[PDB]
Structure formats: structure tokens, C-alpha cells
Amino acid sequence: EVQLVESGGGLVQPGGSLRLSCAASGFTFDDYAMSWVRQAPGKGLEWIGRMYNNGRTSYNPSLKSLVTISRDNSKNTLYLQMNSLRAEDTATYYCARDNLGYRPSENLYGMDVWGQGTTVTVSSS
Amino acid sequence: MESEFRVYSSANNCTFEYVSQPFLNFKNLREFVFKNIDG
Amino acid sequence: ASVYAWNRKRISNCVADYSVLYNSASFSTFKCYGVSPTKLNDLCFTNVYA
Ligand SMILES: *[C@@H]1O[C@H](CO)[C@@H](O)[C@H](O)[C@H]1NC(C)=O
Numbered sequence: 147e148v149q150l151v152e153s154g155g156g157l158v159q160p161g162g163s164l165r166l167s168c169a170a171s172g173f174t175f176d177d178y179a180m181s182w183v184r185q186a187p188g189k190g191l192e193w194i195g196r197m198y199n200n201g202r203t204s205y206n207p208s209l210k211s212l213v214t215i216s217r218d219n220s221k222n223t224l225y226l227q228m229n230s231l232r233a234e235d236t237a238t239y240y241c242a243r244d245n246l247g248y249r250p251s252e253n254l255y256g257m258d259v260w261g262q263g264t265t266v267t268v269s270s271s
Numbered sequence: 272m273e274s275e276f277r278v279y280s281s282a283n284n285c286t287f288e289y290v291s292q293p294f295l296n297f298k299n300l301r302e303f304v305f306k307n308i309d310g
Numbered sequence: 311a312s313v314y315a316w317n318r319k320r321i322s323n324c325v326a327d328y329s330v331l332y333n334s335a336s337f338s339t340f341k342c343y344g345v346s347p348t349k350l351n352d353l354c355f356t357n358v359y360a
Pocket residue numbers: 283284
């Protein structure tokens with residue numbers, strides 16, 4: 147069964163760095179495009195970035211300065227090394243597979259399978 | 272007064288129902304043609 | 311109904327306007343399988359069940 151599990155969220159100080167994981171099972175990244183999407187408490191889903199199968203990275207151009215998406219194909223997992231987390235970086239971070247194949251209807255987000263997402267909050271303690 | 276209906280004992284799996292306006296010395300002659308072509 | 315005792319209603323012998331369902335903002339989930347939602351009004355269907 148195709149299932150995406152994220153881990154690594156929690157409390158994080160302002161101005162620090164926090165690494166997130168997208169340990170995937172049921173499929174490999176050698177032929178699929180993978181995306182990271184955030185979710186504010188008061189706003190909708192905001193697309194962070196995308197990892198292609200050949201290693202090509204694209205990011206949100208208002209968020210390029212502080213995210214990094216990498217793979218570990220030996221462990222079939224995706225990495226997200228975020229730095230300098232401020233107050234608006236509090237989000238529930240979903241990792242999802244892109245649908246470049248057949249789409250049964252119109253999708254607002256273009257994702258065929260989603261993750262449960264991990265929650266990150268930034269405050270004093 | 273119509274008070275006797277004995278045409279069936281059960282009705283299990285329906286696929287089509289259609290309620291319509293009534294079609295109807297011997298005084299009336301009623302001709303009907305029923306055909307089953309391509310369903 | 312409850313999900314274990316889910317109700318099924320036959321829709322038949324009528325004209326169905328699916329453009330008022332897909333364009334409605336009331337539905338949070340609208341996932342169609344085997345048919346496009348904008349092509350629904352251009353097809354005629356048999357054995358429709360809700
Ligand atoms: C037909 O009816 C029987 C008995 O009511 C039932 O077991 C069966 O599943 C029905 N088949 C269909 C296609 O509705």
C-alpha cells in the first residue's frame with residue numbers, strides 16, 4: 147500500500163535549523179516527482195517545493211532562501227533541511243507525490259497520494 | 272370497486288419504474304404493437 | 311443513514327444537472343472515477359445509484 151509517513155516536527159527555537167523527513171514506503175523516487183506543502187493555521191495549503199526524479203529541485207520563490215529538499219534513494223526517503231524558522235514558519239508540513247500521469251478529474255493541488263504531515267511550531271519555549 | 276390484486280408474490284431487484292397517463296356489444300378497439308429491438 | 315446501513319436511492323427517468331453540483335462550493339470532497347466532471351452533462355447514463 148502506497149503510504150507517506152513524515153517525522154521530525156516539534157518545538158524549535160527562532161533562528162535555528164530543523165530537519166524533516168519523508169520516509170516513503172510502497173514506491174520509490176526513481177520515477178516520481180515529490181513535493182513539500184505547508185499549511186498555516188489560518189491559511190490554506192501553500193506549496194513549498196518539488197524534487198524531481200533526476201535530482202532537479204524547484205522551490206517557492208518567496209521561500210527559496212531557507213528550505214532545502216534532498217533525497218536518500220538508498221533509504222528511499224526525502225529530506226527537508228529548513229533554517230531560520232520564524233513565527234510564520236509554524237505549519238503542518240505535508241509531503242505528497244505529484245501526479246504527472248492520468249488524472250481522473252480536476253485536482254486543485256495535483257497530488258495522487260498525501261502524507262499525514264508533521265506539525266512544527268515556533269515560539270519562546 | 273377494485274379490491275383484488277393477485278398478479279405477484281414478490282419483487283426483488285428493480286431496474287426501471289415508469290408511472291404514466293392512462294392509455295385506455297363491444298364498443299372500444301385497442302390496437303398495440305410490442306417490439307424488442309436493440310434493447 | 312449510518313455507514314453500516316447506508317441508504318441507496320435509484321435515480322432514473324429524469325434529466326440530471328451535474329453542473330450545479332460540481333460548481334457548488336458546499337462540497338469539500340468531489341472525486342470522480344472513470345468520468346470527467348465536466349463531461350457528465352454530455353453523457354447519458356443507465357443504472358444511476360446514490
Ligand atoms: C437480486 O435479489 C437477490 C435476492 O433479493 C439478491 O441476493 C441479489 O443480490 C440481487 N441482485 C442484484 C443484482 O440486485
